[PDB]
Nucleic acid binder design. Structure first.
Length: 85
RNA sequence: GAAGACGGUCGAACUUGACUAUCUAGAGGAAGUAAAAGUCGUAACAAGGUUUCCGUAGGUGAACCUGCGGAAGGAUCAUUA
């Protein structure tokens, strides 16, 4: 159950980095209000349906996630699966 | 009538703290600046599609949003009952 991401870029620039694999019993207020106030990018929480509750931060956390995922203590340093859109 | 010498005064200098002024090293940290052809959003000159802005308080990725009292430098110098 690797927390899939996917990115999805509209315009030459109109991107949305999803988060697939994140439980719902986690802090849907602290998850993201810890994100936005961090690398400084518009997070939020939708019920995307090909995935099932994903967190839209507004940005390209493609290089940062690699990292906010060699740290922490929840995910894994191997379950890394980036398909930026 | 010399060296010396009693005690004093001036007091250089030296030793230790305090005081004041001026200058100057510094791991790192956080601003602002340049600036600028980068990344993510669209915050606010045409009513900029939420009129704008002031004082002030709280809050937000970020422009910013919002209440309360102002102003028009506004989009009304008029309202004809």
């Amino acid at each position: 159950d690797y927390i899939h991401i996917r990115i999805q870029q509209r315009n030459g620039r109109k991107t949305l980095t999803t988060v697939q694999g994140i439980a719902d019993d986690y802090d849907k207020k602290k998850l993201v209000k810890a994100f936005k106030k961090k690398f400084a990018c518009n997070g939020t929480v939708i019920e995307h349906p090909e995935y099932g509750e994903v967190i839209q931060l507004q940005g390209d956390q493609r290089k940062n996630i690699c990292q906010f995922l060699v740290e922490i203590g929840l995910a894994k340093d191997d379950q890394l699966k980036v398909h930026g859109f």
